[PDB]
């Protein structure tokens, strides 16, 4: 359980 | 200041006995030289790039 | 059809791209020729290079957000690109701080600067700034992977932090501090001292320095606070939380508001810099 | 190519030497020392320790260069453009004279080349000026004066008359009554040059 | 008073190592190049090494590459030549030559004296088809040279040189670039050519013009010489 | 009796004016109005020499039309190679206030001068491999303003002391001096025959000198301000000057009067340099308006313009063969046009 969908710009 | 006045008078007297010619003769001579040597002037006539040393 | 503030993000991205492709391209062209003859051009050359690279890399978020989070590229691009896109903005911030420090040093020590000041010091400072930006961005290309689920197919890039939770809370606070707190204090202290010394006595008051300082500091603060606060709030909350959704929605708008400064910052140099109109002909 | 690579190397070495020489020589301040005749320029120059005389010294890690061009009797317009980019002027005036000094100051301050160059003003011979003003009043040369016949008021009037000729808000003038003192002219010049270089750096950085 | 004195000669066993020095006094040493031309006891001249001003470029002969080093000490005004593993073919007399390179310069202007050295037991070819020729005072003589590849460059300059070596002396420069006469030489000598053929004229031959003449090229860095022609009265 | 002297001087001047006006039957324009023009002239830069640092003042060509020379306030006097944009020599000066430079026709010596009232000569063919000072010439009371070589042994110099002199380098003694001017002499040009030369000073006048005998033969009083440039016509029977009145005029030696004026209503800036062409049809004159103009000699109309400099064009020159023209400026740059 390791996922948070961080947007490209970050 | 007599010496300077005498020198000026002598200079004027020396310059007052020159030989003069008409203006037309001088203009004609200038034109003759211009149209006699215009054929070898590389500024009025652009030189071809083949012979240009700065191309 | 994306009933979400992302429309404003798209509009801002398009406008910033249009104003940023130009500007700090003629700026970098002008400053490139001035090298080897003026020491006051290296700072602006590096800043313009970083800003131009960021603006040129900008039009990838547009394509990534018009589609519902699909990743055309492979794993290597996913692990390479974000570090390179963060390095430019971090180097820009450090370059601004270094320029302010250089201005303070020039103001408070004229004799020493006249005796000993060469391009080597400027190049060393710029290299140090780039190295520190690289150190800041080094934790990016070692925790970013991609996942392929079994739902209706799509591929998306996201950071993967293991059950060890004490790692995110350290890197986030470190980057927040070393990217927002130190440059702000440096700018404020340096500019306040410069203004006090300049206005202390006559033959130096200009009334333009106050305008330039305000236009720099206020813009920096206003356009950089929301992104940092949103990042530091997101890095702590649990993924299964009700407050996560608002930040998840506002991330893109915050990113656009942050990148607005990257196209604002060359206008100050273009306007304030005297003789720019006459220098364009000389550069050409 | 041919052996012309050796000539190219020679040219590169010459260019490097030229750049090094320019960098080394671009670390000095140059001052002009215009003034009247028998105004006391030589005395203060010697105290500070036919063609053009160039005396120079070093004070507090700063190298100065002073130029005296009083040995040439010609129109000033012919060679005044050669002394552009100078830091300042060291105009000197004696208080025991004077109209020629005012005319020269007015001509210099209104010149086109020197529209943004600071001027340091020196007033010499204070003790003998006080002795003379005790002997005779200032009305001999300034009939329009109306104040008393002491020293401070006359000095202030003369300074104001000299200063009123300026017609540019960007110029700064530093007046001083030296009274044939010692070890103060260098300090005054150092402060003026420090202000000038600070202003120049601020202008060059883009804050003006 | 330009002068160059050499030291460091003697007898060397095979497999040894020695050094040679060239001391200069009378001119600006820092602005001149260096050469190490050598001559066999009974043969012609050969080129060895080159040291440019500023110690930027160093060139070596293909015969001694990887076996000798050239260095310059500008403050002390000395030239060094360190050689290792001397063989039986390295016996010769070594010369010290100076040259300056710019538009209008005259390279190989001055030659040293020479030091002896005895050891115990893709190129351009210059051809001289003459070995001995008799002359009489008041007459005229002609010497010819040839090259495998044309020396006329695109810029219009031909790189050919002529030297004369009197008995028991050091060679000097007479004609450089096939048309220019060196300073101090009389007007009796003139050179001309076209392409791969060259000719030298020695009209008004006196008793001080007896010696051996050499023709050299300066187009490629592996400089090559000729056999030479003897002119005996 | 000064009154009688002044009266006779005025009478002589009036007689001279009447005699000069009695030989003005026609003008140049009326005769020339029946020839075709030259159209438009377009010139473009080919080389840019960037080695100097501050306000190059003087330049001169060489007789081979391949080597140049330049002087700047930085204290350096270097010579260039136009074809390859190379640097071959660099001579440092004792005084940084220099205003003139000259190249010997043989190519063995170079000369310079300035505000120190001394003319120096440098030797470029030393056997030691370096350029060294040969002689230092002194004797003038004011600053130097021009210097030209006659041969490898004698030089001519114009100074600000309202005088000119002829020197001998072998002994450094002033052989012949020339007097008669009133203001500061600024320009000097040499005739092709090397038997006469003209000069122009700040009293708005010019006069011709004889080298062999130090006498003045003729005087011209056309302009109304300080003369800054002068140059002989290639034929050798005319010359053109330039003043701060923003005008240029042509004089004839045989007729002793002006012939044409070169002025426009849109030009107010003065002239700093003047030069001719190989055939004498073109006239190039630098201006204070940061640019130069090319004018027809026989028609008195503009036939081109040269731009590219951001400051004063302080010097000008044309090669012997007429291949190119060189311009110098206060921006520390040199350009070659063709």
Q: DSSP state, C116?
A: S
Min CA distance, E22 vs chain F (Å)? Answer: 17
Gap between the Cα atoms of C19 and C25, Å rounded: 11
Contact flag F129-E26 (C-beta cutoff 8 Å)? no
Gap between the Cα atoms of D25 and D18, Å rounded: 10
Total Cβ atoms within 10 A of residue E180: 11
| Assigned token pair, F294 | 């090319």
Gap between the Cα atoms of F77 and F88, Å rounded: 11
Relative to beta strand E160-165, strand F45-49 is unpaired
Gap between the Cα atoms of D173 and D119, Å rounded: 5
- Among D102, D73, D104, D76, smallest CA distance to D163 is for D102
Identity of the residue in F66, F81, F129 whose CB atom sits nearest the CB atom of E100: F129
- Among E55, E77, E78, E80, smallest CA distance to E69 is for E80
Q: Which residues contact C153 (CB under 8 A, 6 or more apart)?
A: none
**Sign of the CA dihedral C195, C199, C201, C206?**
positive
Identity of the residue in F66, F88, F129 whose CB atom sits nearest the CB atom of E32: F129
Query: What is the number of domains present in chain E?
Result: 2
Range(s) of the domain holding residue E190: 126-232
Q: Does D152 touch chain E (CB under 8 A)?
A: no
Identity of the residue in C159, C163, C255 whose CB atom sits nearest the CB atom of A9: C255
Total Cβ atoms within 10 A of residue E173: 21
- Using alpha carbons only, what angle is made at residue E188 by residues E187 and E190, rounded to the nearest 5 degrees? 85
Resolution in A: 3.1
Burial code (b: 16+ CB inside 10 Å, e: under 16) for D95-121 equals beebeebeebbeebbeeeebeebbbbb
Task: Kindly state the helix (H) or strand (E) to which residue E193 belongs, with its residue range.
Answer: strand E190-194
Alpha-carbon C137 to chain mean position? 13
Q: Does D7 touch chain E (CB under 8 A)?
A: yes
Provide the phi-psi class of E141: left if phi over 0, else alpha when psi is between -120 and 50, else beta. beta
Q: Does D26 touch chain C (CB under 8 A)?
A: no
CA distances from D29 to D26, D62, F316 (A): 9, 8, 32
Contact flag A2-C82 (C-beta cutoff 8 Å)? no
> Alpha helices, DSSP H only, in chain F?
2-21, 28-32
Q: At B19, phi and psi to the nearest 5?
A: -95, 135
E147 lies in the same domain as E213: yes
Residues of A in contact with C64 (CB under 8 A): 8
For residue E165, give the CATH number of its domain: 2.60.40.10
| Assigned token pair, F232 | 């002989």
Gap between the Cα atoms of D116 and D85, Å rounded: 10
- Among F309, F222, F299, smallest CA distance to F257 is for F222
The secondary structure of F139-151 as a DSSP string is --SS-EEEEEESS
E178 lies in the same domain as E215: yes
Gap between the Cα atoms of F43 and F164, Å rounded: 38
Gap between the Cα atoms of E92 and C239, Å rounded: 89
Gap between the Cα atoms of D182 and D185, Å rounded: 7
Relative to beta strand D88-89, strand D29-32 is parallel
For C159, the 3-state DSSP assignment is strand
Provide the phi-psi class of E54: left if phi over 0, else alpha when psi is between -120 and 50, else beta. left
- Among F232, F301, F36, F278, smallest CA distance to B33 is for F278
Task: Kindly state the helix (H) or strand (E) to which residue D124 belongs, with its residue range.
Answer: strand D122-124
For E56, the 3-state DSSP assignment is coil
Task: Kindly state the helix (H) or strand (E) to which residue E164 belongs, with its residue range.
Answer: strand E160-165
Residues of D in contact with C269 (CB under 8 A): 206
E137 lies in the same domain as E204: yes
Q: Answer with the one of E84, E119, E154 that is the final residue of a domain.
A: E119
E88 lies in the same domain as E40: yes
Structural domains in chain C, CATH included, are 6-283 (1.20.1070.10)
Residues of D in contact with F142 (CB under 8 A): 72, 74
- Among C245, F7, E136, F33, smallest CA distance to A4 is for C245
Classify residue B48 by burial, with Cβ atoms within 10 Å: 0-12, 13-18, 19+: exposed
Min CA distance, F69 vs chain D (Å)? Answer: 15
Q: Does domain D28-203 have CATH number 3.40.50.970?
A: no
Gap between the Cα atoms of D129 and D138, Å rounded: 10
| Assigned token pair, C199 | 């206005």
Min CA distance, E4 vs chain F (Å)? Answer: 13
- Among C90, C249, C59, C240, smallest CA distance to C180 is for C90
Q: Do chains B and A touch (3 or more CB pairs under 8 A)?
A: no
Min CA distance, C272 vs chain D (Å)? Answer: 7
Are D36 and D104 contacting, i.e. CB atoms less than 8 angstroms apart? yes
E106 lies in the same domain as E17: yes
Query: For the CA atoms of D52, D58, D64, D69, what is the dihedral angle to 10 degrees?
Result: -20
Structural domains in chain F, CATH included, are 1-338 (2.130.10.10)
Hey, which residues 1-10 in chain A have their CB within 8 Å of chain C?
A: 1-10
- Among E232, E224, E222, smallest CA distance to E65 is for E222
Residue with tokens 């005396």: D55
- Among E122, E121, E108, smallest CA distance to E45 is for E108
The secondary structure of F170-223 as a DSSP string is TTTEEEEEE----S-EEEEEE-TTSSEEEEEETTTEEEEEESSS--EEEEE---
Residues of B in contact with F40 (CB under 8 A): none
| Assigned token pair, E83 | 């050689």
For C2, the 3-state DSSP assignment is coil
Q: At E157, phi and psi to the nearest 5?
A: -100, 135
Gaps in chain D following residue numbers (C to N > 2.5 A): 49, 97
Q: Which residues contact E162 (CB under 8 A, 6 or more apart)?
A: E173, E174, E175, E176, E191, E200, E213, E214, E215, E216
The topology under which CATH files domain B2-54 is: G Protein Gi Gamma 2 (4.10.260)
Relative to beta strand E58-60, strand E78-84 is unpaired
Gap between the Cα atoms of F274 and F198, Å rounded: 14
Total Cβ atoms within 10 A of residue E127: 13
- Using alpha carbons only, what angle is made at residue C123 by residues C118 and C129, rounded to the nearest 5 degrees? 135
E152 lies in the same domain as E215: yes
**Sign of the CA dihedral E9, E10, E12, E18?**
negative
| Assigned token pair, D36 | 């009247």
Gap between the Cα atoms of B38 and B34, Å rounded: 6
| Assigned token pair, E65 | 């590459």
Min CA distance, D201 vs chain C (Å)? Answer: 7
Total Cβ atoms within 10 A of residue D79: 18
Every domain of chain B and the residues it spans:
2-54
- Using alpha carbons only, what angle is made at residue D63 by residues D58 and D65, rounded to the nearest 5 degrees? 100
Are E210 and E232 contacting, i.e. CB atoms less than 8 angstroms apart? yes
Residue with tokens 């023009």: F37
Residues of E in contact with D10 (CB under 8 A): 53, 101-102
Contact flag F128-E28 (C-beta cutoff 8 Å)? yes
Are B15 and F218 contacting, i.e. CB atoms less than 8 angstroms apart? yes
């Amino acid at each position: 359980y390791s996922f948070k969908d961080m947007p490209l710009x970050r | 200041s007599i010496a300077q006045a005498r020198k000026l008078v002598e200079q004027l007297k020396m310059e007052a006995n020159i030989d003069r010619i008409k203006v037309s003769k001088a203009a004609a001579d200038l034109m003759a030289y211009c149209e006699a040597h215009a054929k070898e002037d590389p500024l009025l006539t652009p030189v071809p790039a083949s012979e240009n040393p700065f191309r | 059809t994306l009933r979400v503030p992302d429309i404003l993000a798209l509009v801002i991205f398009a406008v910033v791209f249009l104003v940023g492709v130009l500007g700090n391209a003629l700026v970098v062209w002008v400053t490139a020729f001035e090298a080897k003859r003026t020491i006051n051009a290296i700072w602006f050359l590096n800043l313009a290079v970083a800003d131009f690279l960021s603006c040129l890399a900008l039009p990838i978020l547009f394509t990534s957000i018009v589609q519902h989070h699909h990743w055309p590229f492979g794993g290597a691009a996913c692990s390479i690109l974000p570090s390179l896109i963060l390095l430019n903005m971090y180097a820009s911030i450090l370059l601004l701080a270094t320029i302010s420090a250089d201005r303070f040093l020039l103001v408070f020590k004229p004799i020493w600067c006249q005796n000993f000041r060469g391009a080597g010091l400027a190049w060393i400072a710029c290299a140090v700034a780039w190295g520190l930006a690289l150190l800041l961005t080094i934790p990016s290309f070692l925790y970013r992977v991609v996942r392929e689920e079994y739902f209706p197919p799509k591929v998306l890039c996201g950071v993967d932090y293991s059950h060890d939770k004490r790692r995110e809370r350290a890197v986030a606070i470190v980057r927040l501090v070393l990217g927002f707190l130190w440059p702000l204090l440096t700018l404020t202290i340096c500019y306040t001292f410069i203004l006090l010394r300049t206005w202390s006595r006559r033959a130096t008051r200009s009334t333009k320095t106050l305008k330039v300082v305000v236009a720099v500091v206020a813009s920096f603060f206003i356009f950089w606070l929301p992104y940092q606060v949103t990042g530091i709030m997101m890095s702590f909350l649990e993924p299964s939380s009700p407050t996560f959704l608002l930040l998840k929605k506002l991330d893109s708008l915050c990113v656009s508001f942050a990148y607005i400064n990257c196209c604002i910052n060359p206008i100050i140099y273009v306007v304030a810099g005297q003789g720019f109109q006459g220098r364009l002909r000389k550069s050409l | 190519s041919a052996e012309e690579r050796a000539a190219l190397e020679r040219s590169k070495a010459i260019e490097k030497n030229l750049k090094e020489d320019g960098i080394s020589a671009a670390k000095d301040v140059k001052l002009l020392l215009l003034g009247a005749d028998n105004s006391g320029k030589s005395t203060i120059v010697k105290q500070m320790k036919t063609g053009i005389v160039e005396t120079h010294f070093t004070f507090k890690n700063l190298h100065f260069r002073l130029f005296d061009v009083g040995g040439q009797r010609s129109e000033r317009k012919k060679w005044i453009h050669c002394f552009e980019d100078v830091t300042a002027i060291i105009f000197c005036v004696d208080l025991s004279d004077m109209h020629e000094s005012l005319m020269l100051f007015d001509s210099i301050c209104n010149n086109k080349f020197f529209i943004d160059t600071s001027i340091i003003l020196f007033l010499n011979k204070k003790d003998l000026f006080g002795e003379k003003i005790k002997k005779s009043p200032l009305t001999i040369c300034f009939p329009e004066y109306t104040g008393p016949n002491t020293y401070e008021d006359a000095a202030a009037y003369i300074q104001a008359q000299f200063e009123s000729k300026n017609r540019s808000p960007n110029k700064e003038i530093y007046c001083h009554m030296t009274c044939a003192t010692d070890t103060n002219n260098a300090q005054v010049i150092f402060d003026a040059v420090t202000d000038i270089i600070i202003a120049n750096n601020l202008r060059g950085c883009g804050l003006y | 008073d330009v002068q160059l004195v050499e030291s460091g000669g003697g007898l060397v066993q095979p497999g040894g190592s020695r050094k040679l020095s060239c001391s200069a006094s009378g001119f600006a040493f820092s602005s001149f190049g260096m050469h190490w031309v050598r001559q066999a006891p009974e043969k012609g001249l050969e080129w060895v090494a080159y040291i440019s001003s500023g110690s930027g470029t160093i060139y070596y002969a293909d015969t001694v590459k990887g076996r000798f080093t050239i260095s310059r000490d500008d403050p002390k005004n000395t030239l060094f030549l360190q050689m290792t593993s001397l063989r039986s073919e390295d016996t010769a007399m070594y010369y010290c030559v100076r040259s300056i390179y710019y538009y209008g310069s005259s390279p190989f202007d001055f030659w040293g004296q020479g030091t002896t050295l005895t050891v115990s037991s893709s190129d351009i070819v210059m051809t001289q088809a003459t070995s001995s020729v008799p002359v009489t005072p008041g007459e005229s003589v002609s010497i010819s040279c040839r090259s495998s590849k044309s020396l006329l460059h695109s810029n219009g300059n031909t790189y050919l040189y002529w030297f004369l070596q009197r008995p028991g002396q050091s060679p000097q420069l007479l004609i450089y670039r096939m048309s220019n006469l060196a300073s101090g030489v009389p007007d009796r000598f003139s050179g001309s050519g076209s392409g791969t053929a060259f000719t030298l004229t020695i009209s008004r031959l006196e008793a001080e013009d007896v010696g051996v003449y050499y023709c050299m090229q300066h187009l490629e860095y592996p400089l090559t010489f000729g056999a030479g022609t003897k002119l005996e009265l | 009796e000064l009154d009688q002297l002044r009266q006779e001087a005025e009478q002589l001047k009036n007689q001279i004016r009447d005699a000069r006006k009695a030989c003005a039957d026609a003008t140049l324009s009326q005769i020339t109005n029946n020839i075709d023009p030259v159209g438009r002239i377009q010139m473009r830069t080919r080389r840019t020499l960037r080695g100097h640092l501050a306000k190059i003042y003087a330049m001169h060509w060489g007789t081979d039309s391949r080597l140049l020379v330049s002087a700047s306030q930085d204290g350096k006097l270097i010579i260039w190679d136009s074809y390859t944009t190379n640097k071959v020599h660099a001579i440092p000066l004792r005084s940084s206030w220099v205003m003139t430079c000259a190249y010997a026709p043989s190519g063995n010596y170079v000369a310079c001068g300035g505000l120190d009232n001394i003319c120096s000569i440098y030797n470029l063919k030393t056997r030691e491999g370096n350029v060294r000072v040969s002689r230092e010439l002194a004797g003038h009371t004011g600053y130097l303003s021009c210097c030209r070589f006659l041969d490898d042994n004698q030089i001519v110099t114009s100074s600000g002391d309202t005088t000119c002199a002829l020197w001998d380098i072998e002994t450094g003694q002033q052989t012949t001096t020339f007097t008669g001017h009133t203001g500061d002499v600024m320009s000097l040009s040499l005739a092709p025959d090397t038997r006469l030369f003209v000069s122009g000073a700040c009293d708005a006048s010019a006069k011709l000198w004889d080298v062999r005998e130090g006498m003045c033969r003729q005087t011209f009083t056309g302009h109304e301000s300080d003369i800054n440039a002068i140059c002989f016509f290639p034929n050798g029977n005319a010359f053109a000057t330039g003043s701060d009145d923003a005008t240029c005029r042509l004089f004839d030696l045989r007729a002793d009067q002006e012939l044409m004026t070169y002025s426009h209503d849109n030009i107010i800036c003065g002239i700093t340099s003047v030069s001719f062409s190989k055939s004498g049809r073109l006239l190039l004159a630098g201006y204070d308006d940061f640019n130069c103009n090319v004018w027809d000699a026989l028609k008195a109309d503009r036939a081109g313009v040269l731009a590219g400099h951001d400051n004063r064009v302080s010097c000008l020159g044309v090669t012997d063969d007429g291949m190119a023209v060189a311009t110098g400026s206060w921006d520390s740059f040199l350009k070659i046009w063709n």
